[PDB]
Amino acid sequence: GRRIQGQRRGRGTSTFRAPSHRYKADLEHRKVEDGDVIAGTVVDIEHDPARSAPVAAVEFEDGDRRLILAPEGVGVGDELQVGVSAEIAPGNTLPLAEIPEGVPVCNVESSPGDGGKFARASGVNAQLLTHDRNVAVVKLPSGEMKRLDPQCRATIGVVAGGGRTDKPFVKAGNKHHKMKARGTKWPNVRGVAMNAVDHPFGGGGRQHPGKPKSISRNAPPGRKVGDIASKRTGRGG
């Protein structure tokens, strides 16, 4: 048959790429030698086209002007600090070790100095639970307990723009506009609505998958479709 849509994706053609040239900033934590003597002032609050969430323009002491992944409650004029000795207030960034347990955090680093990887989407947050000289246990937004190096930096507070998901798109056009700002092909044609040549579920006199939807982890691309290595399906039991 023909390559399935999921296979066309990987080639990285225009249709599947994110409108990168239209994006504003790669939101990473600043690098500080040590000491913490790095503070800046929020100069503006802007919309981030890559995340449908606000972002903050900060002007640092040493003349550096950069956009920052903004937590809720950050405003123009506010002074933010980054470093070991940073104050424990919303919007500041310091290593997990300097953060008091039980405090909501966002933009958590996976490896110390990577600029942040976890809890960055609208209104989310990680929960710093356990401290130690060896490991800082953080609960990610998915509910998972993550063991991290206490040296991994993070920002105090929950990510801004919380509740974005609360409102329905209502119409195709609204989804369309959002989709145009992402690396995604939309709308979505169901496999079962296609011809056999185009998809493992295509074909038939009526619409139905011709086999069980639960596919093995070992299935090759072009065949891995439907419910991937599902431990279970449905709602009952």
Partner 1 sequence: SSGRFGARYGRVSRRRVAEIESEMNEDHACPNCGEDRVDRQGTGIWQCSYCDYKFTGGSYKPETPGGKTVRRS
Partner RNA sequence: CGUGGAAGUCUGUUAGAGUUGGUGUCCUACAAUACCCUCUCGUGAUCUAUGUGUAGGGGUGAAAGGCCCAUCGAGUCCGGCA
Partner RNA sequence: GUCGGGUGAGAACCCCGACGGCCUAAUGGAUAAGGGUUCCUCAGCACUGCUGAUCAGCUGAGGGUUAGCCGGUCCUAAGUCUCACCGCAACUCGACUGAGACGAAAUGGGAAACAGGUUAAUAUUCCUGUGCCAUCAUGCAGUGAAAGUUGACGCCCUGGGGUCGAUCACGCCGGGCAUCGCCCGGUCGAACCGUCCAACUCCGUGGAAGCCGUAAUGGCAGGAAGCGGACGAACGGCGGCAUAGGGAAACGUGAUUCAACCUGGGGCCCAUGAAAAGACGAGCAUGAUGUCCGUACCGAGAACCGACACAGGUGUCCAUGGCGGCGAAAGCCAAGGCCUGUCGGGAGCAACCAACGUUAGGGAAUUCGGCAAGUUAGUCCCGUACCUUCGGAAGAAGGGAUGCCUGCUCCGGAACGGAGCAGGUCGCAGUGACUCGGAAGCUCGGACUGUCUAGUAACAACAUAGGUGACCGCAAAUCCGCAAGGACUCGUACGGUCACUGAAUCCUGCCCAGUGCAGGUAUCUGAACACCUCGUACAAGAGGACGAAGGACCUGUCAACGGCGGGGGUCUUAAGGUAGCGUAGUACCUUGCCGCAUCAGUAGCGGCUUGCAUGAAUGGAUUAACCAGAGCUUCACUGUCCCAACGUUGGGCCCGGUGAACUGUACAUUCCAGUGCGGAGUCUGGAGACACCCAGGGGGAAGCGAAGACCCUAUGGAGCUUUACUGCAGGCUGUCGCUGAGGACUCUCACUCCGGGAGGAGGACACCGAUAGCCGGGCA
Partner RNA sequence: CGAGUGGCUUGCUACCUCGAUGUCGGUUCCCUCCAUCCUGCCCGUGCAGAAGCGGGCAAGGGUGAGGUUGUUCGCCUAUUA
Partner RNA sequence: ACGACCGUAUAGUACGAGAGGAACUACGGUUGGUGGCCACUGGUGUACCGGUUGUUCGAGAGAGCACGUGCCGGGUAGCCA
- Least separation, in Å, of the C-beta of 87 and RNA? 22
Q: Could you give the CA distance from residue 152 to residue 127 in angstroms, rounded to a whole number?
A: 14
Task: Report the site for partner 1 in 70-99 (rule: CB under 8 A).
Answer: 70-77, 90
Using CB under 7 A, pick the residue from 30, 66, 131, 146 that binds RNA.
146
Using CB under 8 A, pick the residue from 56, 80, 94, 225 that binds partner 1.
56
Using CB under 8 A, pick the residue from 167, 217, 231, 235 that binds partner 1.
167
When CB distances are held under 5 to 8 angstroms depending on the partner's kind, the choice from RNA, partner 1, Na ion, none that residue 71 binds is partner 1
Q: Which stretch binds RNA (CB under 7 A): 73-81, 87-95, 97-105, 224-232?
A: 224-232
Give the residue carrying structure tokens 């960055």. Answer: 120
- Least separation, in Å, of the C-beta of 160 and RNA? 10
Q: Are 116 and 153 in contact (CB under 8 A)?
A: yes
Q: Interface with RNA includes 186 (CB under 7 A)?
A: yes
Using CB under 5 A, pick the residue from 190, 210, 211, 216 that binds Mg ion.
190
Q: Interface with RNA includes 30 (CB under 7 A)?
A: no
Q: How many C-beta atoms lie closer than 10 Å to residue 225's C-beta?
A: 18
User: Which two three-digit tokens encode residue 15?
Assistant: 């249709």
The values of phi and psi at residue 5, to 5°, are: -50, -40
Q: Interface with RNA includes 111 (CB under 7 A)?
A: yes
Strand, coil or helix: 52: coil
The residues with which 66 forms a beta bridge, in sequence order, are 58
Q: Render the burial of 19-37: b for 16+ CB within 10 Å, e for the rest.
A: eeeeeeeebbbbebeeebe
Using CB under 7 A, pick the residue from 23, 64, 73, 89 that binds RNA.
23
Q: Interface with Mg ion includes 208 (CB under 5 A)?
A: yes
Pairing state of beta strands 126-130 and 227-228? unpaired
User: Which two three-digit tokens encode residue 1?
Assistant: 């048959």
Number of residues that this document lists for the chain: 237
Q: Interface with partner 1 includes 177 (CB under 8 A)?
A: no
Of 107, 116, 83, 82, the C-alpha closest to 157 is 107
- Least separation, in Å, of the C-beta of 205 and Mg ion? 10
Residue 134 to residues 59, 130, 139, 190, Cα–Cα distance (Å): 34, 11, 17, 49
Give the footprint of partner 1 on this chain (CB under 8 A).
44-47, 52-54, 56, 70-77, 90, 100, 102-104, 122-123, 125, 156-158, 160-164, 166-168, 170-171
Give the footprint of Mg ion on this chain (CB under 5 A).
1, 26, 188, 190, 207-208
